[PDB]
From a paper:
The crystal structure of the native protein was subsequently solved with the partial model obtained from the SAD data and refined to a resolution of 1.9 Å. The asymmetric unit contains two subunits. Analysis of the crystal packing using the PISA server predicted the existence of a stable homodimer formed within the crystal, consistent with other TetR regulators and with the SEC profile of MAB_4384 in solution. The DBD is composed of three α-helices α1: residues 12–33, α2: 39–46, and α3: 50–56, where helices 2 and 3 form a helix-turn-helix (HTH) motif. The LBD is made of seven α-helices, α4: 60–82, α5: 88–104, α6: 107–114, α7: 121–143, α8: 155–170, α9: 178–188, and α10: 205–211. The surface of dimerization of about 1,700 Å2 is mediated by 31 residues mainly from helices α8 and α9 of each subunit and involves numerous interactions notably five salt bridges, fourteen hydrogen bonds and van der Waals interactions. Interestingly, we noticed the presence of extra electron density in the LBD of chain B in a rather hydrophobic pocket. Due to the occurrence of an extra electron density within the LBD of MAB_4384 and that the closest structure of MAB_4384 is LfrR in its ligand bound form, it is very likely that MAB_4384 was crystallized in its open conformation, i.e., its derepressed form that is not able to interact with DNA. Residues Arg55 from chains A and B are about 56 Å apart. From these results it can be inferred that the DBDs of MAB_4384 are too far from each other to bind to the DNA groove. These observations combined with the presence of an unidentified ligand in the LBD strongly suggest that the MAB_4384 structure is in an open conformation.
Residue numbers in the entry:
A (entry chain A): 14 to 213
B (entry chain B): 11 to 212
Write the structure that this text describes.
Amino acid sequence: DAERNRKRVIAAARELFAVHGLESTLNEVAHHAGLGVGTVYRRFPTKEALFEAIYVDGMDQLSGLAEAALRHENSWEGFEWFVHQMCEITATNRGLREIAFSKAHGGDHVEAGRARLLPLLSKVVERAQEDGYLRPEASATDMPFFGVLTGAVSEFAGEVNADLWRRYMAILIEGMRRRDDQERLEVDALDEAQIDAAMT
Amino acid sequence: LRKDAERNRKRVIAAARELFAVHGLESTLNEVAHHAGLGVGTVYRRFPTKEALFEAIYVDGMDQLSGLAEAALRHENSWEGFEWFVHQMCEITATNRGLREIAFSKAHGGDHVEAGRARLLPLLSKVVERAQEDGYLRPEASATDMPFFGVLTGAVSEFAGEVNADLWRRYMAILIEGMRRRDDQERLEVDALDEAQIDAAM
């Protein structure tokens, strides 16, 4: 029962985030969710508590998408499909983009969410590389930067050009495909330690 | 007087760009003057506000980018010239968080800004078109892709931090690889912005 209201607050907050960024108060989230103000406060005493819950919820969402991508028949199509689904979340919602990348997070819940997501990202990259589709320099830590890159397009271009991020996402994915005439990427992706220290 | 005023202008801009790499846009007008070895009154009369200093830096930055495109067109190979130019362009904002904020987070207008953009844009088109006509660069590419290469590589440095100061070069190389013309590639479904669109976005 309380878990149902918890999901409704998160879903209502993500809807408001696409238009209002992070400016919406807990009262406005409660109205949009159709819940009493005390119900949102009993679930999330502060906005930072709501912000962290949305971040962890977004990671759990990426995990389910990565698990679905690993069920696809072709590992390259699974990789491209996952990148599409991942980047769309933050490229079309400036509030989520601010939480995902322009925010530092920590604590037990955040660590447990990253612990589930990071190995799934590794398996998606590993499978496409083993079948010869994805270039061998690729890493699981390239995935967050695909989200950062596509989100920065929408942040700069604005809502008038709301689809422009798809152009540069397609360019990025094409640059990741393995070709014979490709030079080794001189700068390696961040390792597990570096990507951890970057977003905390 | 024109030779001396031009020297003090380049002095202030170079000192501001050097401070902005470390402090972002937090450096004050007085700190810029001390770093330039110029009197506070001289810099203050030239730039009474931080916003005036940001516009002169931005206009100077487009002039620097115009010179880089000019040099790139003198390279013997059109693809190496395109690669070299994109590297030189992105390095400006990918290694200086203050310049990155001025280039893509501030709004810019006025006669000097419009005149600078009008000289830069056809030079960007010539670098792109040369590599396209040789069969290296994919036909969908446009001059208006160039500012987004700066935005994209800049967001890498913004997210990764100064401890990972070279990471932007990795994703730049990925972007450049994805711009190659291929006999078999799917056409980019979303077109680059036109001049009217990229002027409104800036």
